Design a protein around this ligand. Structure first.
Ligand SMILES: Nc1ncnc2c1ncn2[C@@H]1O[C@H](COP(=O)(O)OP(=O)(O)OP(=O)(O)O)[C@@H](O)[C@H]1O
Ligand SMILES: Nc1ncnc2c1ncn2[C@@H]1O[C@H](COP(=O)(O)OP(=O)(O)OP(=O)(O)O)[C@@H](O)[C@H]1O
Ligand SMILES: [Mn+2]
Ligand SMILES: [Mn+2]
Ligand SMILES: [Mn+2]
Ligand SMILES: [Mn+2]
Ligand SMILES: [Mn+2]
Ligand SMILES: [Mn+2]
Ligand SMILES: [Mn+2]
Ligand SMILES: [Mn+2]
Ligand SMILES: [Mn+2]
Ligand SMILES: [Mn+2]
Lengths: 344, 216, 344, 216
């Protein structure tokens, strides 16, 4: 790529401008992706935070397990060893000065909580600080939780179930608040299941457990929709853009062709050049994403991993190479004499 | 001695929306090693058209063009390996220097660019010490002669020069067409040289004159 | 724009390709905008559907009214004439075969419902069909709703409060289900308020009433974030793109300048040309949006108005004109002799 | 009779990365109505540079250039209203036809394009019936002469022609420089015509020869 590379020194402004638009695109993706992986955790972060390998549910109709319609009998709790019972309820919480609905999860006393949340399951109720503020209550006060008086044992951080912050309470309290003999709603398995399930039981990978949350499903539609139109419109807009860019090279390409440049040669040159400008632009746009993203996690939800930035970047770089290929194939397709008709 | 280039009975017709234009008409040309055939004619008589098929820049609408010792090769590899073009206008790649205009041809031919051959060819065409110039810091005649120098960088056997002195003062024109003649003879090239400077026929073995797409 | 317009006939492929990328952008906006105006209605569509002009709340601390912490006493209901009392609760609903939490809104018997929902407030409970299916209940069955047995009077369509479909019940039933003497949570005013509020009352425009929903606020952040990065990255990507496009005109512009073309002349030409290609691209991208959008409302939420398509389109057309201006100003800034150094 | 163009003591110096190049050196030129001054010199002696400041295509590094009867005007309006350029290369706008190459100048000068004047100027330069051709369907000399025709469309008082016959057979060259001389005299133009065809001095009132950026 003799010519391709010196085009860049010869006009570093022009190429900055093109790396901008490629980077700006990688930005828009890395941003929206993590802003929507954000809303997604508004249903899932709490059980995610609890990191179970498998989670055993309960249905009787052999149907899809559901967090709303499953419960673990105190004897069920022993047919699974190395298991912890988790209670998931949504109930009204009420202080003297305000009220709200909120998710209540129950674990056995002393269960260490996710560091995402911090602490240990004490007796009584551990409130998200933001929830305690809202209610205007502190550790030691009394709240009504599902009509039962419960003591605020202390505050903690905020993970979430079905769009509300989780209040962490001990099994007995969760039993009181949810009005049930059951010890929990599901069982949490940290290793793998060294046993099999009855006709009415069913293990799920933590991925499947989301399927059992009623708010997850009725939304997972609306998020994938965004995740999809984003990647579609984007990849097309990129392939198109690199095409109109590489097309500014028709003349020089046509001259080179006439002198005898083979189409591989010209493809190599055009790809090698786009490679460099693309790589600069995705690197730069995926950088300002992470940073500008990590810098915004609160006051805004924003989940972002590494298959979530290096994932798109390798996707634009791959797609931008294509759009250049479309342009070079277009010029090199025709007898050089006609291409020099573009030259004027 | 077998010909280097056979343009056997060849024509070029272009669509004129509705009608046609017969740019070139049943051209018959055969050029043998060491020959420099001038080409002459009024503006728009077929001079460039004849060079463009001679150069495999387009297939002829009819007839055939055959470079010998390159039979069993595609058009592009033919140009790359066996033809030198002095384009009617300079067609310099706008981000290269004068020296690089020539080196890039070594490159696309697949060999490590010879910085010193470039410098020497640049000097022969009268441009010593200008090998660093960007296209926009070269005059019209300076460009023509980078264009010329570029043609001479390879090891072609057919040399096609399309009015290569159009922008040169008489003094330099003489030097150029002298150079063309020399490397034609030194290397047993077949050279086709379009020109309007009929004075320069003096340096040409034979010459073809053209009117209305035909040779006379 | 003698030259500008004939450039277009001379190369209609090249300009299609550029209208594509502009249209593809208008698409991406019109799509994501309405997909996010979609999630937004997942909290608001039900009270929206009820179309109140003003809605009177109740606080005692003079604080921000909140749907969770307000109630209308049966006597309050008369100090406002031409008003209807609405009860908003979130409670557990339970059938024989399944359960869930769900929003329950109460209106006085016979209140005609939004056509968005259809029907009239009957005695008992009117269930979203999707909720009835989920529970596996039909009109005539019995459900537990907030621990009270309630009869399914019939099914209806789905509007929403805090991420769940609303079950429509009569004031007395809502009073039973929510365990309160209050006749509702707020009052609905269809005209304007011909009266003033006490120290503990507060009227809100329907825009403000959203501020009183606890899920709205803790999300309105995450949606505006998207609505913002979308328009920012977009407008920049457009301004940049039209700039690299119009820049392919430097040579012809430089020739024109040398011949004597005034900078107004050249700006007019470049704008008039971009005008046409932009207008084609936004028109086309805003068309395929509406259609492709109206064609997807279910199985996916998608709200889209007319300031929501003609809104962006006029925004890209305006921004694309700018990017062309940046390019022409750039060429016409310099002595024509230097610009003809671009010419080669 | 006052001069049409005063190039009073004017120079052009270009940055050569580090060093400089004095393209033009203290040029003094004055041209009066009806005069056709040929300009001559070896390739790269300052011929085009002198025309570019004569044309207000750039300000001179030093000295002044003044078109009279256009004092109190900016550079661009000067060119638009008072100068005709036959560019060294054709510089045709690549989406226009031959006819449109000329009409566009009426347009940018703000007047309804005269389809019939265009057709006539096209015929004078020897291109009757080619006014519909796209640039790519024109030969090199055909283009030169659209370029020439375009220069003659206005009502200029200064006419700058930069080797306008470089691509023309002798027959047509004679016709062109004849035409140049005629419209120069008919209209009392000041015409500067760069050329290497020293034969054509015959048609020029005086002439300036150039070496190393200077007049002699
Ligand atoms: N692509 C085309 N479409 C239509 N007509 C064309 C096309 N190319 C060339 N012509 C016409 O074909 C003829 C041959 O042009 P060509 O450039 O070969 O002539 P030339 O003698 O080499 O030109 P010149 O001497 O003026 O530089 C010209 O008359 C021209 O008008
Ligand atoms: N932009 C530039 N930067 C540096 N040097 C330049 C630049 N432009 C021109 N030169 C040099 O200035 C000189 C004048 O060039 P100019 O084109 O005026 O000469 P010319 O006699 O008109 O050219 P020719 O007769 O060969 O067409 C040349 O020697 C050229 O190398
Ligand atoms: Mn017990
Ligand atoms: Mn033969
Ligand atoms: Mn020709
Ligand atoms: Mn010259
Ligand atoms: Mn004919
Ligand atoms: Mn009552
Ligand atoms: Mn004077
Ligand atoms: Mn010159
Ligand atoms: Mn010619
Ligand atoms: Mn010197």
């Amino acid at each position: 790529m003799f010519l391709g590379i010196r085009d860049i020194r010869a006009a570093a402004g022009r190429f900055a401008l093109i790396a901008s638009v490629v980077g700006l695109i990688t930005l828009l993706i890395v941003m929206l992706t993590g802003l929507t992986q954000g809303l997604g955790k508004q249903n899932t972060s709490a059980i995610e935070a609890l990191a179970p390998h498998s989670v055993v549910f309960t249905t009787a109709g052999g149907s899809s397990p559901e967090f709303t319609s499953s419960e673990i009998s105190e004897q069920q709790a022993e047919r699974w060893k190395d298991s912890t019972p988790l209670g998931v309820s949504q109930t009204r919480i009420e202080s003297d000065q305000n009220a709200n609905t909120t998710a209540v999860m129950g674990l056995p006393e002393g269960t260490p909580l996710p560091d995402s949340v911090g602490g240990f399951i004490e007796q009584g109720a551990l409130l998200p600080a933001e929830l305690a503020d809202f209610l205007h209550v502190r550790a030691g006060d009394h709240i009504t939780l599902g009509g039962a008086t419960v003591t605020v044992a202390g505050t903690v951080k905020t993970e979430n179930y079905s769009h509300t912050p989780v209040v962490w309470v001990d099994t007995a309290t969760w039993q009181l608040v949810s009005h049930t003999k059951a010890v929990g709603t599901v069982l949490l398995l940290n290793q793998e299941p060294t046993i099999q399930p009855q006709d009415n039981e069913v293990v799920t990978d933590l991925k499947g457990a989301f399927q059992a949350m009623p708010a997850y499903k009725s939304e997972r539609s609306s998020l994938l929709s965004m995740q999809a139109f984003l990647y579609i419109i984007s990849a097309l807009v990129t392939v198109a853009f690199l095409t109109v860019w590489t097309l500014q090279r028709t003349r020089d390409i046509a001259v080179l062709a006439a002198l005898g440049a083979s189409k591989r040669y010209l493809l190599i040159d055009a790809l090698g050049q786009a490679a460099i400008i693309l790589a600069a632009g995705v690197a730069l746009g995926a950088g300002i994403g992470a940073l500008l993203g990590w810098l915004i996690a609160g006051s805004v939800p924003f989940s972002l991993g590494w298959v979530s930035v290096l994932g798109p970047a390798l996707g634009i770089w791959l797609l931008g190479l294509i759009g250049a290929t479309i342009a070079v194939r277009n010029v090199t397709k025709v007898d050089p004499q006609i291409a020099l008709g573009a030259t004027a | 001695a077998a010909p280097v280039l056979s343009i056997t009975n060849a024509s070029v017709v272009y669509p004129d929306g509705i009608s046609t234009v017969t740019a070139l008409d049943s051209a018959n040309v055969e050029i043998f090693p060491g020959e420099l055939v001038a080409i002459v004619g009024e503006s728009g008589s077929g001079k460039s058209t004849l060079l463009s098929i001679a150069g495999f820049l387009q297939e002829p609408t009819s007839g055939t063009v055959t470079l010998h010792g390159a039979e069993g090769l595609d058009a592009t590899s033919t140009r790359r390996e066996h033809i030198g073009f002095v384009f009617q206008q300079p067609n310099l790649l706008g981000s290269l220097t004068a020296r690089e205009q020539l080196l890039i041809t070594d490159h696309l031919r697949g060999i490590k660019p010879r910085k010193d051959r470039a410098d020497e060819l640049l000097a022969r065409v009268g441009l010593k010490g200008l090998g660093g110039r960007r296209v926009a810091q070269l005059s019209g005649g300076q460009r023509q002669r980078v264009n010329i120098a570029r043609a001479l960088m390879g090891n072609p056997q057919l040399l096609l020069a399309d009015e290569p002195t159009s922008a040169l003062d008489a003094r330099l024109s003489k030097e150029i067409v002298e150079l063309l003649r020399d490397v034609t003879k030194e290397f047993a090239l077949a050279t086709l040289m379009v020109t309007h400077d009929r004075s320069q026929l003096a340096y040409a073995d034979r010459f073809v004159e053209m009117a209305d797409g035909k040779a006379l």
